[PDB]
Structures are given as structure tokens and as C-alpha cells.
Design a protein around this nucleic acid. Sequence first.
RNA 1: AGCGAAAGCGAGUCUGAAUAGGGCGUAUCCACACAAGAGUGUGUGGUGUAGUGGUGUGUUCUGGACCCGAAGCGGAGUGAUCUACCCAUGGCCAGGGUGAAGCGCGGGUAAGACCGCGUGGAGGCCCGAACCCACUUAGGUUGAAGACUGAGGGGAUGAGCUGUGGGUAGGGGUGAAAGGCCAAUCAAACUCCGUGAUAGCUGGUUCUCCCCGAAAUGCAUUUAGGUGCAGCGUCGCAUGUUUCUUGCCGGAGGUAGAGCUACUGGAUGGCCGAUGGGCCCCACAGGGUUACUGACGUCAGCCAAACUCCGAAUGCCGGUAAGUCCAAGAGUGCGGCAGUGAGACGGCGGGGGAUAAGCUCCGUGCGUCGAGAGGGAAACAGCCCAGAUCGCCGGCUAAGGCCCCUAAGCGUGUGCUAAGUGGAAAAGGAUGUGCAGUCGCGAAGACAACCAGGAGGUUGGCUUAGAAGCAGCCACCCUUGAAAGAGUGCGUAAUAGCUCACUGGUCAAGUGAUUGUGCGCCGAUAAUGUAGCGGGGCUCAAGCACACCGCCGAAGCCGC
RNA 2: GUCAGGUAGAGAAUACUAAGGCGUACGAGUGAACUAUGGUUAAGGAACUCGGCAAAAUGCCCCCGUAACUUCGGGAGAAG
RNA 3: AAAACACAGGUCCGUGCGAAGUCGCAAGACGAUGUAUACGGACUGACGCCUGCCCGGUGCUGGAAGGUUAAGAGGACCCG
RNA 4: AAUUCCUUGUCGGGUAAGUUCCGACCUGCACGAAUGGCGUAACGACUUCUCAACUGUCUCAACCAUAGACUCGGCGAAAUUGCACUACGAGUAAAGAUGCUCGUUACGCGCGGCAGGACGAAAAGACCCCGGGACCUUCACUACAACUUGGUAUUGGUGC
RNA 5: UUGCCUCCUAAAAUGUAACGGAGGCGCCCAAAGGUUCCCUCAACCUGGACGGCAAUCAGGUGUUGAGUGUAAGUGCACAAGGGAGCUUGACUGCGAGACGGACAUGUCGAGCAGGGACGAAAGUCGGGACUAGUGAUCCGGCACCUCUGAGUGGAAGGGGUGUCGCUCAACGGAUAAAAGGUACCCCGGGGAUAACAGGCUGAUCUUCCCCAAGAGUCCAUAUCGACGGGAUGGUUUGGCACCUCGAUGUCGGCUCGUCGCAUCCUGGGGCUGGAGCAGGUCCCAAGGGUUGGGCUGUUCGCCCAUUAAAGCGGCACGCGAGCUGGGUUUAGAACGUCGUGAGACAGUUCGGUCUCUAUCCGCCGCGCGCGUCAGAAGCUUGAGGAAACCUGUCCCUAGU
RNA 6: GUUACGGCGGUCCAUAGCGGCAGGGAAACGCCCGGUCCCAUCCCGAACCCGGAAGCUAAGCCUGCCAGCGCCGAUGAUACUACCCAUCCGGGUGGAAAAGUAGGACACCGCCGAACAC
Lengths: 79, 426
Amino acid sequence: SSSRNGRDSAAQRLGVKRFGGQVVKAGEILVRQRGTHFHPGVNVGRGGDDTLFALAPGAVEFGAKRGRKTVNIVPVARP
Amino acid sequence: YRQLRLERVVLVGVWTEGSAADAEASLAELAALAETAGSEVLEGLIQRRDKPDPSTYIGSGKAAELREVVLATGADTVICDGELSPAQLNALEKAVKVKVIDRTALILDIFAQHATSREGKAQVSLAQMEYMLPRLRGWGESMSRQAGGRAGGAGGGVGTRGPGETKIETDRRRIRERMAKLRREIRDMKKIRDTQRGSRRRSEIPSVAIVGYTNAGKSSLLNALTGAGVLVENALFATLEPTTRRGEFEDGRPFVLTDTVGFVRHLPTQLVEAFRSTLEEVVDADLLIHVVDGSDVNPLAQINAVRTVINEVVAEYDIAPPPELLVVNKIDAATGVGLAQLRRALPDAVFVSARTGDGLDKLRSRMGELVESTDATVDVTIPYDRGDLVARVHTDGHVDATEHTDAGTRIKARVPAPLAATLREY
RNA sequence: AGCGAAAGCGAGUCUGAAUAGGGCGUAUCCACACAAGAGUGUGUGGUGUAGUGGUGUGUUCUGGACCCGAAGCGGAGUGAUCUACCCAUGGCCAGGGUGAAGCGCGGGUAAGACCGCGUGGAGGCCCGAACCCACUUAGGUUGAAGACUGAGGGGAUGAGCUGUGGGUAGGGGUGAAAGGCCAAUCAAACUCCGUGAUAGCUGGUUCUCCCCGAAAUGCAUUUAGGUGCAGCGUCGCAUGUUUCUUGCCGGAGGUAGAGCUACUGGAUGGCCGAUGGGCCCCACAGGGUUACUGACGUCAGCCAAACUCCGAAUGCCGGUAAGUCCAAGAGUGCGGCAGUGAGACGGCGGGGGAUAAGCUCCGUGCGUCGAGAGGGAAACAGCCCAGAUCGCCGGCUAAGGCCCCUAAGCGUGUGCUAAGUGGAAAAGGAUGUGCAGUCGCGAAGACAACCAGGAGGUUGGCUUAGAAGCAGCCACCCUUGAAAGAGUGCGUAAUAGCUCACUGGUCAAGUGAUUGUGCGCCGAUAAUGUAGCGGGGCUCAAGCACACCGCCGAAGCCGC
RNA sequence: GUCAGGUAGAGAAUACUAAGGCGUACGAGUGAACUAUGGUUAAGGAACUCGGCAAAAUGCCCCCGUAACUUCGGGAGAAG
RNA sequence: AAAACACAGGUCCGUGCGAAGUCGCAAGACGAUGUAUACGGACUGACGCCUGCCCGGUGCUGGAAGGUUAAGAGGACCCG
RNA sequence: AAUUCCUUGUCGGGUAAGUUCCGACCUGCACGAAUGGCGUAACGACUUCUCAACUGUCUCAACCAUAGACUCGGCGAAAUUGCACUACGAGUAAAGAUGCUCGUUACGCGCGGCAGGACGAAAAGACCCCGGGACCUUCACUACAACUUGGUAUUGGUGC
RNA sequence: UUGCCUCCUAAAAUGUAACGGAGGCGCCCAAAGGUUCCCUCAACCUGGACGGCAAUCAGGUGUUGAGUGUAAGUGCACAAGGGAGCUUGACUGCGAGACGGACAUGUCGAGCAGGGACGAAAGUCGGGACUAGUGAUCCGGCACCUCUGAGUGGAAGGGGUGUCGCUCAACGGAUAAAAGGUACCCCGGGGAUAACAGGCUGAUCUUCCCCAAGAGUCCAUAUCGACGGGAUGGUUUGGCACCUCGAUGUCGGCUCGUCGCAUCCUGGGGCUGGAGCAGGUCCCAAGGGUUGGGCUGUUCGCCCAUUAAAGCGGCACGCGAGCUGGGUUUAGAACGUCGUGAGACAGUUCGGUCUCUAUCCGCCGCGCGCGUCAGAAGCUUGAGGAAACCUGUCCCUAGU
RNA sequence: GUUACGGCGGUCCAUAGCGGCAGGGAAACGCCCGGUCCCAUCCCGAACCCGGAAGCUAAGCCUGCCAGCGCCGAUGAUACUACCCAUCCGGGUGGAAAAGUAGGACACCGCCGAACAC
Ligand SMILES: Nc1nc2c(ncn2[C@@H]2O[C@H](COP(=O)(O)OP(=O)(O)CP(=O)(O)O)[C@@H](O)[C@H]2O)c(=O)[nH]1
């Protein structure tokens, strides 16, 4: 005599963490996603739950490949 | 009025009395009625109990048998060929665990959908409502767990508890009150019928009417015997309001022919109460036309059932019952080789077919014969300065206009009291 | 002097195979080399380290712990002088009836059985005062009285009533059993003590000014009116513009919108039309005809919170240049002290509901009230204007206003309204009145008018009482082209009168249909009294629209 | 708890009185409504009302006369 | 104030005698100076005609062949 | 039916008219034999119906007398109480206004009466919810009294 | 219903509630894990012995519509999809830097060393394409250890590392261990929260309408009006919980009224399928009037007699500081049914205390005072208000 | 320098792709002719791998035309939208789509150049 709904999960705080042009450290998490909505580019690896992370200091720079997004890092070149 | 879904029905019924064939005949109407409401009929079990059970209509184990069949065919309903009390139809619900809604409820509901005129709708709600008054505690959800009470009764002082009455009383009062408004409303509609029939009342006219059970024709005989095309659907209760048309034979006096609603066996004694239109007619007529189908297993049955309702009418109104003609139809197209039996002992078993096959010739010529006496007869000598003597002399309803001369006209015809009247100068 | 669970070691130490990472320590700072720019390390020199004990103040622990207030729990006692029952010994019951056993005598019977007449005086017997109750009614109901009174009422030789003296005591007594009674108290009496019981609950908490100034949110909870932590406030210390606003630059998205031949569903008409049903030749070999159905295909028109080939505006993250800068009284870290954790309404975007509520639940660098005075909305926390340091018998204004109430305009120019519209309302009905175009006739005097025009085979059929121009109706190729159609409508059963598409002398502008374009009319409709302008009153606008000109108006702004 | 006068009367009821004791502690007025307690009522006689609540009615002695039913006592002061 | 309690009359169960039952920690007392035709408890409730079927559940009573199981007796084997 | 929801079941009596009453039927929502079944003379301040007699119960009220009420003299309280020279209508407000808005009405002060309002007085709502008590029940938990079972001490001897 | 995972609501970052809308999870796999290498579906056309239409084999067409252990989403044809050969990294000592964040938890990590697997070596490997498949602390069990050992030597006990024990599923887990009744009730609070009345709304209710398919002897509109649509009123059942729980007394009846008109009679009309007598509709109209009984607690309802008629509603469902107390709603008792039982029924039946001296406004009557430009007296005008307002039968006109 | 092979260019990976018609073989790329050897098929020297060098541009690959199918796509309007104004409607200042239209487009550049000169 009631609703057969009413249960949800928790909101996993996904999405992009570092946006483009932002100076980053070695090992910071750039994107926490589920699939590969962003594929890893240069100096960017992929974790076990498909999160991307930095492999070198620099500045995160979004890009493209053959029909798929990438998240790159360009080095910051100390003056 | 309630409208949901079914189409899955298992019919049940106690054979307290009647022949075997007679017994399954009832269950059969129930099939036709069930389908006339539009729902597929699966199985159908009948028992032989000399008298129903005060708790479950059929029995205890038979209820158990029905419980499994409802799980088998998944039928969402069960209809009982009888009138059952609120209690019996509530116990049998926890047994089979599905609809246990009786016959009177099928008929009362068919009348809700099939009926159009506003008047017809009102009479329905009365019926449905009078059928639901005696079922309030049973539908006791409003009282289901209405145990919220225990109101203190220190009394002789503040209680501020307003109910100065039990909830059952207060609630019963409402349904009974609405029923009373409708009651006065329906009795008023009487004046509308009477006023729509003032012309016919005056100018006395003949008035044949067509009684007879449902599915016997009636509205086929009218659509053919005169003219006009009224609903002639092959289902049940297809005419929920009376119609009247003109027509005549040699005596053109209207032989106004009315068509009525159908008298099924064992009326639900509810919606019929307000179906007075059909009966107001039976009373005020000059003949009746009991139509019975030859394509019926036993035609004689409906003859008596129908005749009974006509019996009660003549009784209340203290009337010399009108002449009645019983015309058998469905013959010719007679899906009946049991035809000869009726013919052995049946009055006016005309092979009316109403469909193709006609058969209406003998009836028409034998129709005006039973109608009440005419009252116009006259032979006269009319001067040549007529131009007026034609009053209605030729131009009248039955004015004969059947004799002539050279001198004006030695007319020899028939004339009503208010028409040619006494004016005629022999 | 620290690290370690510890043995122990000691500016180190623990874990580890590690001379290798880390963890916790070596007060902090400055200088110099070597490394490393994976975010700074490592050694060498200097400087060199702050605790403790009185005591003022703010929180806090254990104590009654800011104050007041339960129903009830335990220990030891007091009560049977009221009431419940019982024990011992006394007292009382006017008057009048009825007539049991027993006995005697007659009748009666084998006898018994019983039946009359005397005698007798029985009974939880009858009528009825004292006495004991308390059934009905009325009065009292700050009473004469903390349970009575006046009338009636029940028992009254009994399971009766009553006096004196005794006995049973609290988780116990006593109970012809009502949770009744046990000193006007009873689902466990009263008094004193533990005791200042304990209450997430209610109430109360007392002199002043100055500065700052909230919240009704998130998570968890034997939790939902409580509390813990975070958020927001204040005070102190440290850093210094890191905060905020605007412009430019670099990014991720999938809402609004749109689209569907780009997926998944729904879905309106056609067209080809296999594949199947009827009929089919009834061979099941087989001719196809198909009001059926026709998967896919195909043409055109569509829809979607859980459809997306696309896809904004804003918002968000970062960078960069400025602004504000004798102030936002900005941000951030650490401490002392909190309160708050029931929000309300209005705007915009949504769920639940009937796309009801002054309904309910969310979002919103949204607002006001809460915690906000002043002016306008007639009055009127949540709407509009505006944020009160004090004084003034100074000036300018905001929202709103300027006929009188009531400060300032019965203001100026051009138009509209006849409804008191203004000063409530719908589907819909409708010959109101201004505007603007359009269409034939179109100052030819068209149109209106007085008017000759009356049964063309006109009683046609369809049929015949006649179908009496004319019950009804399915057509007006029709003309001296005049202005009547095989004469329709009112009528007229039949007559009989006149027009409906219609017109000739007299001759002076009219016929529709649009934009709905302004403003208006009806629909319209409760119950104390006009009562749907705040009042009087207003069309001689004091109403409406568009321009224009002043002024009144607050604790706003200026002056002193 | 004890005494218990006289007339009526079955009575210790009730009415009036003897012996004896009291006038018992706010009064004087005054035809208001209204309330309480008594009294009377035309014609009708439960029509009132939840309900004959209340009121009215019956009432004593002496002769007659007494039903269904019965557990044989009664009912019974039946009723009249 | 009653239709409720009691009641005379029923049946069942317990009790062989400082009985059963009750008050009391115990002695003791009531039962009763009573003795199963007596006493206590339960239900029914004058009187008349009657009181039907069921012993699976749960109780009560009466039984034993096995299973199960406490303390007390037992002390192999192991360990310090 | 002190038991029947449907229900004012149906039929018969009683009344001019009978949701109550009496007698039957039986379909017993959900009677039933010592939580006794069905009857029954007598009995009841018990409950429910009908009738005769009677009446101010009523149609429909009227009059009389006492005790109050009312006037005069003496004595002389009470509950209640933020204020006070405490109108009405249509509105507006915590949504039901003597006290706010706009009107309308109204000279000041008393005495006898009536009870519409002051959400009138009295009693920190007996109903409802939350929190805490209390007493009661049981196949709720955990204990204890009481009853019962065995070992062992008081407790010993000869037999087999 | 209570914890975890996925989608939408969720307003293009993250987050976001409701007893909003849909589903899953308390596993499985010793290969369905690690690694090296290879491959590309589904469907459609043309072909067979079945084999349907669709089982294996041919040739084409086919870029993703198939398949991924399991819900959904995000992905994946470069494949994470299909196949094969070895194997155990489903490791030990660690972990720069971060995400998320009340806290407790949770999550991702390049890289260094030891010992391996697979590869030619580049390198990959700390379980599975990802996100669920779980439980804090306390108290104990077990294996190993270069810790401690109550005078000393041992030992018992304790300690470290690895790990095992809970539908503590009310899933941040009050106790190792716990159900009901109260109408016999009591106390502390609450209009934070219900019953009565009021307020907002108007689904249901009620009263009107708009269009006109039909009905009405023929005939949409004399009289009705279906399917659909638009509203008024605030008298019903409701929805919300805004005042009142340091009290706003609750049905029916009695007594007393006052108001609205949506008119029952009486009074005017229009239309009639209005011959007359009687009617049926619609408009105008609120001055007066609108009965007595039987049954029921009853309002309502049916019935008996009448009448010109026996109106509908508002006023705390008007009216208890004006009355009753039949009913509902305390404590007693009984029946039927439910519960093992205390007790329950929103079933029935018998019985069950109705308090108050009127202060203020209001209303009905009655005085005293002053005023009305000197003090008195007789008789009056009427601004303004109040009261009343009903109706029948018979006769003549006329049996016209 | 002409230049008809590689590998990634690497391109916000179809303006680059499919589909037609006509052409080419210097070296290179290829089909090809056989498996004795290294190594291979769940069966097959088909493929993988090996040894070759008789023909021949059928095909892959490359070149030139085609706007046929797909693919990019403006300007201007329109939807929508932030802020502001407005007593009920609706406007102003900025930003601006989707679909369509005009059109674009049979790719363009790097490298030891790889080959081929002089
Ligand atoms: N086979 C057949 N059927 C006939 C004949 N005559 C009449 N019928 C049937 O009778 C029916 C018509 O009569 P109907 O209109 O049903 O009578 P009705 O009583 O008005 C139906 P309702 O119950 O609604 O009033 C038709 O369905 C037709 O099948 C006949 O001659 N032959």
C-alpha cells in the first residue's frame, strides 16, 4: 500500500579535478571518472578505477586524438 | 460509476431448484450478460445445494475448489448467478481471493454504460446507490481501523469532542440523504414525461406497445413495421429509453407504436424501480406485443416470466389488462427446428423474421384487429357546395371516403366526434 | 632528551635484509659550500633555548552546584474511636391479620389413603409505626450541611437492628466480590527519615552605557522539541590583500532550445507491397482475386525527466591587468568564549497534489522579516522606497501623489469612454462607438421610398381525398432579357393575401467583410447595514492613452 | 437507655389538648417581574414527553363474590 | 442497587489424622476439643425433563524397557 | 434472541397511522447442553409493551397565600481583578476586534429586570501525541521464596 | 521502510529533499587472475539433407546495431569482445604526491629494494573494463617471534607480527541476556500534533450556464437535452494544520428570534403541443403566512388526517453564565466475536451528579441632573423611527 | 633537382571517406613458382615461416577527372538566455543556437628522403 522505491546510492564525487592551464605536481589526480571519457595523453597515466593522474610536474592541457579526448601535461620550463 | 478491468471471469451458481437444463440456462444468460459487459468467460461451476450457505453461497470445499481455479486461469473475477448478501460475498472473497460480485451487480453496471439520456443516468445512480447502502461496514475501510476512538466520556462537561454521534450514523446519514434528494428529483421528471405526451393523450389515438424480454427483437419489429432505425445491437439491454413512432393501417389512427426496455428474468429490483417509463406505457395502451424468439431453447419460459411483470403492473393500477398479442420472431431465420412445438400450441406464431424473411404481412393485418373499438361510422348526402364538406371528410385520419355520387356526393364513410363530427348533414 | 610494545639505544631512534625509503624528535633564526630545481635537501660555522611559584578573571571536574516544581521508590514507626469482618456480654421490635406440624372428635377404608368440625400457634409469612436503609422526584449546589432537606419508597421475629469491651495492619488486613473499606485520603494508608530524590519538560534569573553581531544548515544518534562535530558570531595572536568587483585569456560540461534517415521508445496519413487469412481449382500440381492483414522499405507531418547527430546564456576552476585601499572593518591558520541546529513570505527553476491551497519538500554571492525604526500600499512582520549617533519652528528629493477630507494641479495640448466602465471574473452571445485598409455598385444620383408587376402548361410530377401556385423534397441552360423559381418562406387543411434571387417616373450617398485594432455591453450570483473607489463626491473628469511643465513628500541627501 | 395522662382511634399512627416547657436571638413594610412550596379550575382527557417523570386517582370496617395457571401452599385484599 | 454477588440443591478433585489447607523463619495455632454421612478447594445455582461426540494439543493422575543428563566417586594419558 | 451486520428480514395481531411490543417462519454474519440447554407456580423501588380509572403533563394558561426578590433602619462578606471617560456596521489583522482603518450613531449619573458577547469565572485538558510513573497479565528477560532429586555429615553392628 | 551500488528528479562543475520515479546487492572465478602472440562480430543476400525462418559449411554485403560472469550508467572494434602457449604479482619491505572529507571510515598512486612469472627485450604484473558482494570497538581462539618474566633459574600469564569469531540486517553497532494491558489510572508538557467550531482551497457537493447529436404522433430549442467545454456558491465528504490543550462544553428537542432568495402559498406577466376547467415552463416579486398526530434518541424518512401552502438555507451544523439529558463518550454488569491471559469491538443490552450573588458592552423598562440666553404654564408642528400587512368557502353574474 | 616506396607526420582525424570513368610499372611495392631446411595450422605451406625470379600489371598501390552518396558550413533572422524596466501583458542592453540557405570540398604540409640526376 506504499511506494516500492526510495533507495539511492551515495554521490561519488566524480568529474574533473584540475582544469586546464593549472600548474600541477607529480601524482595529482586530474580526472576521476568511470569509463575512459578522457583518455590519458603524454605524462598522464590511468589508475585502477580509470582515474587519470600526473606523471610529471607541469600544466594540464586538454587535447584531442583520433576521435577521442586526451588530458596532456606540458612542462612549465623554469626561467 | 466504477470502471476498471476484468475479462477474466469464472462463473458460479447454486442449483437450488429447476431442471438440469433449466439450471445451465441461467448460467448461460450470465455468459451473455458477462460478455455484454465485455469480459472473457473461462470456466463455470454449478453445485446442487437445496439452499445456499449463510457464509459462502456455495459451500466450504467448493470455495476451495474455486480457489485453485482462480489461481489456474488467473481470472481476476467471479460472478454468482443469484442475489447474495453483503456477508456471503465478503466471505467468499477471502476464499477465492478475487472478485465475488453477484449478478444483480452485472446488470446494474451494464445499465450504467449502455444508458445515455440524463434521466436514465439518474435512475441508475439511485439503483447503484441503493445497492451500496447496505454495504458500508462491509466496505468498512472507512471504519477499517477506525479505532482511533476511545473518546473520554467524563461528560456532563467539556469533551469538545464534536462527534455527538457514532461515525456509522453520521456516515449513514449522508448516503441516505443524497438518496433522498435524488428521490424527489426523479419524481419530478415525471412531469416532463407527461408534458412530452400531451398531444398523444389528447386527440385520443390508438396505442400499441411492444413488451417482451431482452434480445427478442422489439426494436427490429419497430424499425421494420413502420420506418425508422433505432439501435438494433445484438447484445443485451440495447434500449434504455422508450421510443414512439407513427404508423397505421386502413384506420390511419396512429397505431402509435412504442418500443421499450427489456424484462430479463429476476429483475434486480433496483434499477428497474426507476425504469417506470416502460411500465407507464404498458398501463396506458390498447394492445401489447410480447415478442419471443424461436431460436431459443425453451420459448415458453420467457413468456411466463415476462407475463409476470405485466401481472404486477395490472395489479397495482387496477386495470382491465389490455388485449395482448404474442408475436414470435427469429422464426424463418428460425435457428429453430423446435419450431413446430410452439406452432402446436402458440398464438400468432408469425414467422416474423424482422431481418430478411419478413413475415410481417399477417401481423399488420391482424394487428388493427385487436386494437380497441373504432368509433366512427357514417353515410351522408353532401351538397355540391362542398369545398368545405371535405372538412376532414376525405382529409381525416381514418375517414373512409368510400362512396360517391353525381349529386354532391352520397359519401358513405366514417368520421370522428371532433372532426366531421355532427356537422355532416344527411 | 628523545624514540620504541619492550629488552634497549641515545641527538638520535623505530620498522626493515638494506649503507633505503618513510614516522616521531634534535627551540628557533642567520651565514657558507655541495647537491637538487620532484616542490628544496645535506653538512660546516655562529646565535644560542624558559620554566616555575603566589594571585585577579573566564570556562570546567566532584560535590544540592543558578533557583523553583512531580507522579512515584526504600528504611523505621503510627493508626480498626470512621469503615469491612469476627469474638464475649447486655438491650429493642406499637398495632392488626393469615392459620403449618401435632392432638381430639365425626365421616371414610379389610386396613391404610384422605375429607369436614374443634384445639394449636409454625413461618429468612402479610399489612404497618419506633428502628435500619436509600428507589424516584424537586430544592440546595460561595448550601443550614466538605453528600443534607421536603414529599412519596423498601425491610420491619430475622442471613434483623443496636450498646459496652475486645481482635486482625500496608504488598498486609477485611471483603454475600463493588478495585469496595482500612480516621472527609486507597490499582497499595499516614508520619518522620535517605532528601535540597530525579525530570532531554514548564516557569523564573534583579543596575547602566560604548564596539561588533548571528542561526533555524550538513553528518551521526534508542534519534527527530535533546546532543556531539562542522558551518555562521566575538576577543587575542600570526601572515598581509592572499578576500571581493570589472575587463581580457585558458578549460570541462550536456540543462534551456532544437533535432529524429543519428540510437532507443511512442506515433498521424499516404505509396510499393512479400508474407499470411477468406475465396481460392479445394490436389496438398496449381490461376490469384484481395473492403482483411500487409515485416521491411519509402514520401510527407510529429513527441520524450530516466532519447541525443547537436547544443547555448549564465554558473564553476585557474591565469593575468587593474580597482577598492587614512577601508571592505575582506581572506587564511591557531587558541579563550559562545549561541544556533522548530524558520516565514515574496521573485525565478523543479518534485508531491487535481501542474488546488496562506499546502508540502528541494535549488537560488536572490530579497525582506526574523533581529528593522521612518515614508507609501485605507488599516496590514514577509510587497515598493529607504538602513534611525543626537539637536533645529532650514533646503532638495525617493516610492507615492496634487477637487474637499489631506501638504501639493478643480495643470497645458491632442484624442477616446456613456458603462459610475473607471471602482473584481469565464466559456460564450452581440445591429455600441472611434480609428485603418479591402471589395463590387461607386453624388450616373446608384441605395431607401410611394408604388402598375398576383394563380407561364403554375391543382405538374414523386403522382391521383384534392395532392386546390403552396405536406415534404432531391432543379432554377430558362426571357421584348423588364423586377417571381415547373412559385420557395409566412401563410394556407382549401381558399386568400405579400414579399424571399427581386424593380420603372419623383432622385438630394449608401453594401459588405477584414486587423479583433482602441475603449465599452451582457454572462454576473447570499445570508447583522450602504459594504468589490478609504469617505464625500466626479463625465462642466476629479476616468483612459500619448507628449509637456511645476510642486508636495521619509529619521534618505545637504546646511549648522 | 428509663417513665408513657385525656378524648376519638386497632394503635407508641394522626388530629386536639392536661402536667410541663417554649415564642430559638435581625426587624418594619409592601397586591411588580421572576424563582420555590402549598390551593383551585371551564370544555377536552396523555393530544405532552425518551418515558404517564410529576400530579391526580384508589384507600377504612362489615356482609356478599372471586379467573387463567399451579410446585396444591397459593394467585387473593384477585377482580367486582 | 441491577439481569450483578450470595443462596438452599448438584458434581468433580484433594484429605487416614499434631490430616489436607492457611498464618508463622521456627516452636506453635486455626481446621476441631472435628475423623470421610467429616473437612478444604473449583465450577454450577430452587424445581421439572435432560446433560450428546472427541484424550490428538495443554494440564492432572498412574507406570517402565531403553535414550538423555548434576554434584559426589574415579585417575589412564599429557604438561611445569 | 440482553446473541442477527444486511434489517424497519417476511407473514399475522394491536393502532386512523406501530424503526418499539407479542406470536410464528428459518437464510444461526457469529445459539447450544454444569463458562449448563429448554421450560416453570410464586416473588421484583429490575427492563420492555397494551388497557380501564384519573388528572394543568398538555391544547393554553388564569387567579390566591406564604418564603425570597423590591423599599426603609442595623451589622456586613465572596470568587474575580494589566489598564479604562469599556458603541455599532463593512473591513483588516495570530485567519472570530470595546481598544486598528473608513464611516454611522450617541447629553452626564443611577435603579429593577434579561442573559447574546467579554473566545465570561472555577480546575497548569480527564479525550489526542510526546516523556516519566504506577498496578495487572503471560509460552518476555533475569533472579528469589516454596516444593522436589541425589551425595555427604549427625550414622552404627552381625549376616549374604 | 532502516546498510551498500547504479540511473532520473538535480536547474550543462561538485553537492541537493520527500512514504518522488525504476532496478540490483550480502556473490562468483584456481581461471572468468598475470603475461606474450593471433583474430573480429550481430544481421542481411545468394546456396545446400533435414537444420523450421534458425544447428555445421561455402561466396559476398556488412565500423558496431553483437558481445562484455551479474542491476544500471560510463566505456570498449586501437578492442576491455573471441582464441591459444606458459604461469601464480590473487607477492614481501615501503611509498613522493593527491581525491573525498564534522569525525570515524573510504579511494588513487609514479617510483626504490628483495625474490619471481611472461616476453627476444621494450616492458607489464600488489587480482577481475570500472563503480556494490559488508560490520567499529571490547572480549577471546590459533600459528610464528632475537620482547617481558613480581628474590634468583625456569614456568604460568602478558606483549609484537599474521590471522579467526556476529542477518550486532533497527547495518556509526544503548545490555551477554527482555513481551503485552490499562475504560481503575496518575504526573510533567504541547494548539510544535488529532476530535468540535472558525480560516485557506473547492477534488467530491450544489446551482447555473456554452455547442447542439437526438428525444418530443411530424418537429433540435412547448418540455428535455447526451458526448465535450466554462463557472458561481461555500450548506457536504475531504485536503492543509493557521488561533485555541495554565479548558473555545459536544447530537437531537424546548423557548426565543434575526437575515438571504436559489419562491411552497398568495400578487403581476411572456411562451405554450394554452379550446374551456386545469396545467407545464421562464421572468419580476421577500409584505404576510407556512398545522396536528403514530414509529424512532433520532435530524432525516415512511405513514394517518388536513390545508391556499405544509419552502430551502445562514447565524460557533444560531441558541446549555436560558432549560432538558433520550443519544454519544468514564468507573458496575451480561450476550456474540477476537486474545493463552490481563483485556478489546470503530457490535448489542440494563444503569449512570449538568456549578456560578451580572463588573463592562448589549437589550427591556424607570428616575435624578443640567441644557435649550429671564423665571413659569397650557395646547401643539413633525425631522425621524416603530407597529400592522395572512387567507378560505358559498351565492349572483351563469349552467353564460 | 625530378621525383608513382617507408615509418610516424599529425591534423580539435571524412573539406581527408565511399562510389564511378580513363591510365601506370625505371628502382621499389606486389601478386606469383615450390617447400629440402628455421618455423607453422585446433584440418590445410590458405594464412605464419623459408628458398626463389619463369610472367605481368588482372588486382593491392599510385595518377588525372567527376559533386553521384555521404562530410564540413557562413551572413542575416528565429528560439533560448544573464541583468535591468514594468500593477496582470510585454519590452531594453549584452551573448547567441539547432535545423535550413549561399557555398566549400575528390586532402595539405615534415623527415634519413627511399629511389631516380649531374
Ligand atoms: N437470425 C435472425 N435474427 C433476428 C431475426 N429477427 C431479429 N433478429 C435478431 O434480433 C436482434 C434485433 O432485436 P433487438 O434490437 O436486439 O431487440 P431489443 O430488445 O431492442 C435488444 P435490447 O435488449 O437492447 O432492448 C438482432 O440482433 C437480430 O440478430 C431473424 O429473423 N433472424
